[PDB]
Design a protein around this ligand. Sequence first.
Ligand SMILES: [Cl-]
Ligand SMILES: [Cl-]
Lengths: 268, 268
Amino acid sequence: PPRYVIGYALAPKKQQSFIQPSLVAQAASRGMDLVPVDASQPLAEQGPFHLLIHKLYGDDWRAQLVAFAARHPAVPIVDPPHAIDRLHNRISMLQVVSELDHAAAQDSTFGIPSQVVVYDAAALADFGLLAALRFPLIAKPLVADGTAKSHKMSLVYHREGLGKLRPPLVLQEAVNAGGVIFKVYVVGGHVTCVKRRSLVVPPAAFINQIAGGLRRALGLQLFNFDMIRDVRAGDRYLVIDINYFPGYAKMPGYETVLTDFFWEMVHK
Amino acid sequence: PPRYVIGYALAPKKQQSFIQPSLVAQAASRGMDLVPVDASQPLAEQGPFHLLIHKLYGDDWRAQLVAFAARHPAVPIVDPPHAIDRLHNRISMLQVVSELDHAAAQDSTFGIPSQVVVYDAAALADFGLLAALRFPLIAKPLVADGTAKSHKMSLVYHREGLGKLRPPLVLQEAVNAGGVIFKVYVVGGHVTCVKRRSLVVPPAAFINQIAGGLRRALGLQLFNFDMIRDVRAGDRYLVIDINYFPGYAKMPGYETVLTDFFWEMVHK
Ligand SMILES: [Cl-]
Ligand SMILES: [Cl-]
């Protein structure tokens, strides 16, 4: 029976969290060898791979990945750098949601929250529209990715606290949220979901339809989304983040899901 | 003396406007052969090129361009598809402006207008913040590029007229504009500038500093930007669009500028 190299290109802190003995063992036992990509050596120079997974950001890496991709058409990349680029900018991140409008009328509806972009300290002070905003506000830096430390979301109650943030940033209103957040982890066509008190769980078929959509639209095997209930109508949900290749190490039995996923991908 | 192939991949309507006998002649006379890229044949199969210029959008084209790029490192692409991707989304388009914050304190300042993204008809109706907006509003579809017909900006006076637009769209306030727009055309390190009454010209050194910045930030040889005067302070300017590979055919003596630019690029 043949054997399958899974190359992996991840920042140290991600490797420490993601690549765990339990993942490495389970994969090995099923015939798949997780193998670190040398960061000090062209990806093209490096050994044959049956699958490449990565979560690195650079014009350098983009370049090597495209050389590889154009040299090795048959080898899956998880995920293709094009598709990852769309979620880097917080306001261009929800662009792709709107895309599967033709989802389900059922007894649940899903939408994207309207957002406000402030590029300079000047506008933070002078922009009239900021004064007609309801607090608290969810504030995210406009171009995240998950590199630079402060590229996670935060909560602004005082309008003072808003003028202490560093632009460029995106804002959305948190007032119809009920104060709850549901983090949904997606691996290919699998869905796993976790509750988290911010600052009455959605139907499983709805969460599955949306993940189904996001996956189609995003062209991404590895993401999560945050949604909230619109507490006005009782039965409506909003997609508020989409973070690529999230911390699966945090959901339990991820080893099994991800090995099951690696397996699917190397018989593709 | 050797001779220089300039491959060109453009939609018909763009070819008709851009590739004119006067451009083709002038280039030929200086030793450069503008050559159409066959849309029915891999770019890799097609003939040797010393420069590639294009303005096509597709996962197909992206693919061929990267094969080529990885096979032919030395050959300039104008422009690299990475850099073009950043201006496709109207709200991710101004992201890159903020980038050269360290420009000039001189006697002129430049900023980006704050923007509001509305993804669904639902929010167009219900979003509180829309009611605290001053009219008229400049309205652009969120993901343009310059393909689908209705991917140019428009003006909303009535709040009725706003609920007749098709989301997703971006909004900015037009009230501090004075009602004027200056279109600035950039070719590498050259700048050319044209006035246009929407609905007291800026210093040439300022316009040059900004173009300088945008070019650095964007990594693009071929763009224009729209700016306006902030009529509150008398001396301040805002960058409101950035459109890639614009209609140079509209500025006079473009043939000469673009042939001068092709020449620079094929001795790079
Ligand atoms: Cl992880
Ligand atoms: Cl043109």
